Amino acid sequence: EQESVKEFLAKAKEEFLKKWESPSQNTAQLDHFDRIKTLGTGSFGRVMLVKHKETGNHYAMKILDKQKVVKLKQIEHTLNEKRILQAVNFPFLVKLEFSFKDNSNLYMVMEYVPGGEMFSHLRRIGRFSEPHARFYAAQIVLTFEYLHSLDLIYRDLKPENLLIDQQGYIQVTDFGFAKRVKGRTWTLCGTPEYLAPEIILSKGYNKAVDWWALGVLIYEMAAGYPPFFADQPIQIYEKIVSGKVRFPSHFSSDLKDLLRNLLQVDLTKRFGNLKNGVNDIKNHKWFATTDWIAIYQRKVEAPFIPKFKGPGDTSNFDDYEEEEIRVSINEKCGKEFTEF
Ligand SMILES: N[C@H]1CO[C@H]2[C@@H]1OC[C@H]2OC(=O)Nc1cccc(F)c1
Numbered sequence: 001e002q003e004s005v006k007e008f009l010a011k012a013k014e015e016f017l018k019k020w021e022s023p024s025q026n027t028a029q030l031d032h033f034d035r036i037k038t039l040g041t042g043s044f045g046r047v048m049l050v051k052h053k054e055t056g057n058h059y060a061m062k063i064l065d066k067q068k069v070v071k072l073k074q075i076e077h078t079l080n081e082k083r084i085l086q087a088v089n090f091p092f093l094v095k096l097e098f099s100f101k102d103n104s105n106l107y108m109v110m111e112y113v114p115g116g117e118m119f120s121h122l123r124r125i126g127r128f129s130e131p132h133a134r135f136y137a138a139q140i141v142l143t144f145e146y147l148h149s150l151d152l153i154y155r156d157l158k159p160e161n162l163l164i165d166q167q168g169y170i171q172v173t174d175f176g177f178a179k180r181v182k183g184r185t186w187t188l189c190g191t192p193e194y195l196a197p198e199i200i201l202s203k204g205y206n207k208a209v210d211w212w213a214l215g216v217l218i219y220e221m222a223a224g225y226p227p228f229f230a231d232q233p234i235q236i237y238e239k240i241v242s243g244k245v246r247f248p249s250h251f252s253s254d255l256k257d258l259l260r261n262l263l264q265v266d267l268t269k270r271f272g273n274l275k276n277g278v279n280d281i282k283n284h285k286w287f288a289t290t291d292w293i294a295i296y297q298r299k300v301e302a303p304f305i306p307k308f309k310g311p312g313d314t315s316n317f318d319d320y321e322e323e324e325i326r327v328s329i330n331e332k333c334g335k336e337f338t339e340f
């Protein structure tokens with residue numbers, strides 16, 4: 001590997017560990033913001049577009065109910081998420097600007113990304129051409145090189161978690177399942193269509209599960225649908241562990257070869273997890289036209305720019321029932337969330 005890549009990753013790890021060992025806490029409060037619109041929801045939390053009252057800047061505020069986090073066994077995962085987000089720094093990761101808690105909730109306030117989900121644009125167009133898919137995939141390869149060098153596993157890659165910014169580049173969001181791992185880890189988590197065989201089989205697993213999920217993502221971007229699907233998760237799991245996959249005839253031979261090596265059921269033979277690491281991917285024939293430095297420096301003109309009117313436009317997100325953000329007059333679950 002070139003010495004400039006080695007020195008870049010060594011400095012990146014030094015800066016991450018300084019923030020990891022001394023996390024920021026309590027850097028705003030709720031009545032510093034005005035609420036604008038709910039951007040979507042979940043079982044234990046929501047994301048809302050908000051405006052900061054002094055500066056006028058827009059942000060995306062993720063709100064988690066402390067009692068529901070405890071009930072759904074997500075305490076350690078919520079603490080991982082905020083500790084990792086406040087310590088990372090890379091061109092294709094969403095930025096955490098503030099965090100705080102109150103009697104009822106935890107809050108993570110991130111920069112707002114007005115182009116919306118990659119998934120929305122994929123379904124509007126049908127499928128991405130191979131040059132368009134390759135522009136997005138190169139950004140994910142560089143982001144995993146960075147996260148894996150910090151001993152982090154991401155564990156939720158899918159098109160709904162990749163937002164498109166005002167220059168047409170990716171911002172990765174949702175670190176709810178991310179974790180710092182030396183060696184192996186064991187938690188069953190993720191989305192069914194994207195799970196590697198070793199997660200389904202309850203084995204001890206490692207960063208190779210993120211390279212499997214990159215194979216699922218590139219297939220989905222280039223075909224318009226993922227490689228393994230069915231009405232019941234147990235049927236999806238049976239197709240994943242089987243060791244077979246069918247490719248559309250319009251795929252190039254170079255694309256098929258790359259996908260057979262990422263969607264490799266034996267984790268000890270999978271690209272990204274061999275002696276040469278990420279360079280088996282960067283040097284594959286499917287990426288021969290990619291300028292890795294130009295992508296990192298954001299100097300390549302993007303294939304597509306989202307249509308929106310300004311920094312507070314919500315037209316690329318969809319519509320949800322608007323509910324209260326209620327805060328109890330008594331403190332809930334204070335012990336469990338002391339470090340947040
Ligand atoms: N389809 C699901 C999943 O994404 C949607 C919808 O529910 C929640 C929504 O999440 C967001 O808008 N998050 C978000 C995070 C950071 C910045 C930003 F601008 C938006």
Ligand SMILES: N[C@H]1CO[C@H]2[C@@H]1OC[C@H]2OC(=O)Nc1cccc(F)c1
Pocket residue numbers: 012089090091092093094095171
């Ligand atoms: N969406 C996030 C990330 O890019 C924006 C925004 O936070 C502020 C900016 O920080 C960066 O450009 N970070 C960065 C730049 C060069 C090298 C590197 F390793 C990280």
